[PDB]
Amino acid sequence: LNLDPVQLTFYAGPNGSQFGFSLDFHKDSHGRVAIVVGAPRTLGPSQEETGGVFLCPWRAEGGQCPSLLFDLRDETRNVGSQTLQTFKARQGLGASVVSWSDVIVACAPWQHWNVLEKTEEAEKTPVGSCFLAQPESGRRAEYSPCRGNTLSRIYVENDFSWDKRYCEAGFSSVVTQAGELVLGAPGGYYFLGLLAQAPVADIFSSYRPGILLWHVSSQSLSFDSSNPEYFDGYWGYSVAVGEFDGDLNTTEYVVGAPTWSWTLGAVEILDSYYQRLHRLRGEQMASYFGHSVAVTDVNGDGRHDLLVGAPLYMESRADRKLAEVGRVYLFLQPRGPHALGAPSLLLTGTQLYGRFGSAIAPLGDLDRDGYNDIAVAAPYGGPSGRGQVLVFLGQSEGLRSRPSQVLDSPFPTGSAFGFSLRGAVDIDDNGYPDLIVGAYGANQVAVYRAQPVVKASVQLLVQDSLNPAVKSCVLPQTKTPVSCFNIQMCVGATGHNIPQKLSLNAELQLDRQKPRQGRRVLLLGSQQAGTTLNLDLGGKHSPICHTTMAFLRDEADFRDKLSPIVLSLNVSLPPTEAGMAPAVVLHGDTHVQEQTRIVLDCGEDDVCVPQLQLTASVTGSPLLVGADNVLELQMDAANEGEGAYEAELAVHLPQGAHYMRALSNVEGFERLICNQKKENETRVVLCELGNPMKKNAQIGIAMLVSVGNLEEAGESVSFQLQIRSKNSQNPNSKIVLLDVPVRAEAQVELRGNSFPASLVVAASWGPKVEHTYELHNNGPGTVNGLHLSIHLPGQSQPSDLLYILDIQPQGGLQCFPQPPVNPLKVDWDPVLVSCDSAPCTVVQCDLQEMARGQRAMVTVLAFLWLPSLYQRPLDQFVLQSHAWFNVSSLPYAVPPLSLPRGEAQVWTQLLRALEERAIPIWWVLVGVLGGLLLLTILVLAMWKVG
């Protein structure tokens, strides 16, 4: 925000050396601050690229810097029958430079190591190394935790177990406050990634020149994994340190694996012993999630937070559905050991192929606002595609999406400005942290110095109403009575290390809206509608207040009376003097407007005394935790007293509430306007009720309030409502409090199905039939203590009609049957049968945790028993399976309210290739007998009659 983009400092190195690839700050014993810059491609003595490190002293004009001296010659040693060789050509020394106390660690990831023994060898691979330098005592040491004397044949015979030949140690380095250097090796364990931890003191005290291979007693490394997810994961691309377990003794590490889980990315938080405390997964394929990691306390709660980057993230645009812009994820550490959830904030870039988020650098309290800030670099962002750096300021809820300041790249195209960033250090000793940005393409480092921040508080005071009848003042140089009133302007400047001499220009304008010639109120002194003053606030901790007199013109000179008189005060810095270079940055309340008016229709007393009454009601009372709760507040306001001046409605909402919409039933062309702002910590919504609102006015407002996630608000939430009026008497109405209770409720759905729904058996192992049961937690809340029972006919015996082969549970539920199912190993008119009548087999499943949106599946396989199929094959067979589940409690403070129940029944019907059941020929026989009897009687009729 307060960074100066005009007066920078440029440090340059040898051309074509990639100066500025990595950089850091260094503090000597006297407190002097210098810069350490690594140039991986510096030419060595043998006219070959070997890298180097430069210790730039702090100079305002910058320029060339001296270079620290490191050994750049190949080492060949003979021990026993083995020959150890080190190759430093194109080692890229300085790719990652860190400083701790009085030690500078510069690493060459691409240094090559080899071992020769007769014919076999360990192969020449880029093990990498790190050189530690102590300039004060002029001491040198080396550290290479991935040097071994194992031949390639042994690794081949062991399936490449514990293969550290491709560590590339030094890709990312970090030194803890205790003094334990940690180095990342993405290529270790055959492109799986690893970490190497070692104290600096042990490294210094355990180094003997000429001994290429040695072991540090306190050295520790991460372990290998066989999970296919870690394959080609590059676990160690970025490494950071922080506190996450709540105990100050242990130090937690954050390790990035951009290519984890098939190019998905991950960030793992581990303890000191390399135990996975947490894992954060990526969002999109090939997004390189985890390229850069940073740890800082943005919210100021005292608990470290996490920042992750994904340069290759692709967003959605109308022109093209995929646009590589990159992204940054902010995760906030919650209270307690609760696991980190979804990203707290998402930041997206604008320029295409900008690689936004490739470098995240903490800056501390840059503006001394009590909250930490950060800087995010896009190497190839901006309209011209030359690079940008965006400064994000912190707040109570986290970070601000809008970037406070954007710094461009003075270097030309291809400079990769912003590739390496570093801050949170004061180099000019002005009380504010500075920033350093490298650019290896142009081979230059740019230093930005923070400027003091001055906060301005402006207040304007004036009488609520004016009565032209009363005249007390007299115009200068004459004897003309005229009414007058006092206007008071208070301006105060605050900050840290602000200049001793400070001047601010304050401009006061009266009745700004009206034309200059048509102004109604004019200053008594100069008889002018506007004035300007130069206040010297330098060193004046208390605000400076000034007072002036303003008089109202004669009634004949103007005819407008109802229009309010508006007064504006504007505070600004002095115009740029010789040399430009403004000393400080001013922000805050630099413009304040206050409105008065002429007395009218206030009665004989000439003083308006409004009386305001407010009533509030709430609809949507049931608040469900973890749901898009939308309450509706209906407020009716009336003014039984005199007209209220500048009457507004103030509605203080809880922490998680928000404002969406508001309507006014009264009038259809009123154009209600409401605004929402965070005064200190609460989201106050101000709705305009009316300037001198008329007598007995009654206004009804219906507003929608969206209550966000709430897990600690308690049993009920509180909304406050009041009326704000500028009138001297009864400035506000009665305070209204609405208490909305909160209850937690969740619904669980059980659904059952059978495959195939319809089966036909013709006339060993018979046809396959499976029953599936699913539990779905559609409810917004969370349910624990889930217990389910599935009841099936039979007991898995040869006599049983159906035989259960296997039951597969999915979703983590733990299931056990009774009696045991599948005794044999087995290497392979409707009739109702159910657990109620036939023998019952019950399988019980348990789930202690069932989060929102999770689904649990239980499948059971079986086959109709052919020996039992053959017997009585002429009877239709419908089988039924039953389920019964319920939960114990919920993980929420609010006890209410029991629930949920469940009853699922699954049916399956079987058919045959037509049944041989006795066809109802009985009816045919009865009909034939009846016809025969009728014929016999008919014949006998005329037989006996004749």
Partner: protein, 718 residues
């Protein structure tokens, strides 16, 4: 009625026409007491004033050039014209939207050129043996679809740089596979060998002369080869008048951008071709891998269709990549690469069975909305692509363009192009927000109070405040104040406490945070909803406090989306037919279903439950609900009469259908992983022989008749 033209206007032709899409201006002199010149055309016509001077611009969609769609492409392919119209011109008045329609067709036979890009890692060695005689087979199989075919070959292993190479011992440089006693070529990044040629024998000759290299890292850098093949059009020779196919065969993972840090490469990749006369990637060791965004951009620019013919072990990864890059198809390649021919043959139809549309050179000023028309008159709102097509099928797309104001350019042009096709529609838009009468100018006219003002289209606009109807009230003049002309429905503050009552009208003031307009200074900007640092959701412009949505959006905040592209499943039905799509998200009305498209339901009735109607016509050519034409309207499955009854279909299960004949018809449903659902139905189902009583009763009655005849003849003799 007052409408919205009469109010919030009546200042000049420009603003008057710029208020609402339907307003008219009466330039010809008439009575000025009727509040004329800003109202509906009907009101002006009722008030006359139409002596060829009425100003009322209307949007037009005149077609400049249009040609009929060709039927077959065999010769003179320069004028196939498979997309019509080719170029149209649109003229839109400010804040007005106009619609047009286009048609897309595949012209039967169309020339095809295929470039074969195959990895040459050690594990691929055996595969190289199965391709030595692929050119002739490919030509024979493809001759049934394309009469003009060209084929090509390519290779790629990885970046020749440590740790990807075996730098030591030195013998490994010219023979990395020396430990296993084998001969191999040095590592290379991309080696083009055969250009696209119509001589089939060249493909066979070039193959079997290649070899296989070796590397250390499992992932293979194939994206570099893909990008080099795409960008280097001249080196390999893509043909602009033919359909492009790029087969990418691999059996391992693929590198992405920022993976070159291990080898020291940090320079971002660029799409410029880097293939010299030696036919090799010169910048392989000095250029980083390309990102997916650049790959997709350069693949769409050159109109190249991509086929990921990958082994089963990494099929999921390339399926996940495929849904990102448009116009890409995935396929399973056998371990010996013996399924490549059929894979490419079917992938050709698969890719040509899909039509999409992309917009290029679209300025931010205007927005487009799309409707699609699949086969038959059915229309799917908010969709720019239709699935389930075939060769020769014609589809229609309705495109509605809406603008915001009139940009100060007056000449814009964009293009709508189907993926993988040269032909495209070029749409030229010219904005006309200026009235013709303004050309008269007359900057100084005596009617404007003796030549101290400007006259325009029948109204005098004068000075810095002179606004009287006769250009006489001035700014400081009109000191006496009249009534019943500054506030509506007297009883409210004048000018809504925002403006000054001068000249008899409310002149709005305080031009801060935007502009304020209105006959009573009630409408204004900077008074609308703010979603995230943007007004009216940042999509549409809000007028008079209403967040007027732009195209592709509809809502109070104008955040809800109308286009339904994301909520379309792979079965050709919106949200898999188990739910609706709202604001780009599928809501599953049917219980027990979840997912992005409501497709992953585990507890739904099997497919055969609703397939009874589909199989009716195939086996009987009759059945209920035949009026709806259910034979082929929703089920694309193919029915085949096979009595094999022993297929080992993993993703298949037998089921039964019940007929009025009371005979169970058992049939198989196979849902192949390729999406080619197939039904196997047994013809003439065996109905058990039930009726056997008719013969018995006939014999019984015959015996009774014989007995009766015997009795009759006995009586006759007696």
């Amino acid at each position: 009625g007052p409408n919205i033209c009469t109010t919030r206007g009546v200042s000049s032709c420009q603003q008057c026409l710029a208020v609402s899409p339907m307003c008219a201006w009466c330039s010809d002199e008439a009575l000025p007491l009727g509040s004329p010149r800003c109202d509906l055309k009907e009101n002006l016509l009722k008030d006359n004033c139409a002596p060829e001077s009425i100003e009322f611009p209307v949007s037009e969609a005149r077609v400049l050039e249009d040609r009929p769609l060709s039927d077959k492409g065999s010769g003179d392919s320069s004028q196939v014209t498979q997309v019509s119209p080719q170029r149209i011109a649109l003229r839109l008045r400010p804040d007005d939207s106009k619609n047009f329609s286009i048609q897309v067709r595949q012209v039967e036979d169309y020339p095809v050129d295929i470039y074969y890009l195959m990895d040459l890692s050690y594990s691929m060695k055996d595969d190289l043996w199965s391709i030595q005689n692929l050119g002739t087979k490919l030509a024979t199989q493809m001759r049934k679809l394309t009469s003009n075919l060209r084929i090509g070959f390519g290779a790629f292993v990885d970046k020749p740089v440590s740790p990807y190479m075996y730098i030591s011992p030195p013998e490994a440089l010219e023979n990395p596979c020396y430990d296993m006693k084998t001969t191999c070529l040095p590592m290379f990044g991309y080696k083009h060998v055969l250009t696209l040629t119509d001589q089939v024998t060249r493909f066979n000759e070039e193959v079997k002369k290649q070899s296989v290299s070796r590397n250390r890292d499992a992932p293979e850098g194939g994206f570099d080869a893909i990008m080099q093949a795409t960008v280097c059009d001249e080196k390999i020779g893509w043909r602009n008048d033919a359909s492009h196919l790029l087969v990418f065969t691999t059996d391992a993972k693929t590198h992405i951008a920022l993976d070159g840090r291990l080898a020291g490469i940090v320079q971002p990749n660029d799409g410029q071709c880097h293939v010299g006369s030696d036919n090799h990637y010169s910048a392989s060791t000095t250029m980083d891998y390309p990102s997916l965004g650049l790959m997709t951009e350069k693949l769409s620019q050159k109109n190249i269709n991509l086929i990921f013919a990958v082994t089963e072990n990494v099929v999921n990864l390339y399926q996940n990549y495929s849904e990102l890059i448009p116009g890409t198809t995935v396929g399973v390649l056998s371990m010996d690469s013996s399924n490549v021919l059929q894979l490419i043959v079917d992938a050709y139809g698969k890719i040509r069975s899909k039509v999409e549309l992309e917009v290029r050179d679209l300025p931010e000023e205007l927005s487009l909305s799309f409707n699609a028309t699949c086969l038959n008159n059915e229309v799917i709102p908010g969709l720019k692509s239709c699935m389930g097509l075939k060769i020769g099928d014609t589809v229609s797309f309705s495109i509605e363009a809406k603008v915001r104001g009139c940009p100060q350019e007056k000449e814009k042009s964009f293009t709508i192009k189907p993926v993988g096709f040269k032909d495209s529609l070029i749409v030229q838009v010219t904005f006309d927000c200026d009235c013709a009468c303004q050309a008269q100018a007359e900057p100084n006219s005596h009617r404007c109070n003796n030549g101290n003002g400007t006259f325009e289209c029948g109204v005098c606009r004068c000075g810095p405040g002179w606004l009287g109807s006769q250009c006489e009230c001035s700014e400081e003049d009109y000191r006496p104040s009249q009534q019943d002309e500054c506030s509506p429905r007297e009883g409210q503050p004048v000018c809504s406490q925002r403006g000054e009552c001068l000249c008899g009208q409310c002149v709005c003031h305080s031009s801060d945070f935007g502009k304020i307009t209105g006959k009573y200074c009630e409408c204004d900007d900077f008074s609308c909803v703010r979603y995230k640092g943007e007004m009216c959701s940042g999509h549409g412009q809000c007028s008079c406090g209403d967040c007027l949505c732009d195209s592709d959006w509809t809502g109070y905040y104008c955040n809800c989306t109308t286009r339904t592209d994301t909520c379309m499943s792979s079965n050709g039905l919106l949200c898999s037919g188990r739910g609706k799509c709202e604001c780009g998200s599928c809501v599953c009305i049917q219980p027990g279903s979840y997912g992005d498209t409501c497709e992953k339901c585990p507890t739904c009735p099997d497919a055969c439950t609703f397939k009874k109607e589909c199989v009716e016509c195939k086996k009987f050519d009759r059945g209920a609900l035949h009026d709806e034409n259910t034979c082929n309207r929703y089920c694309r499955d193919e029915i085949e009469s096979v009595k094999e009854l022993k297929d080992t279909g993993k993703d298949a299960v037998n089921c039964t259908y019940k007929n009025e004949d009371d005979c169970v018809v058992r049939f198989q449903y196979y849902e192949d992983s390729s999406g080619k659902s197939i039904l196997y139905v047994v013809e003439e189902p065996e109905c058990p022989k039930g009726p056997d009583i008719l013969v018995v009763l006939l014999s019984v009655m015959g015996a009774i008749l014989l007995i009766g005849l015997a009795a009759l003849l006995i009586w006759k003799l007696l």
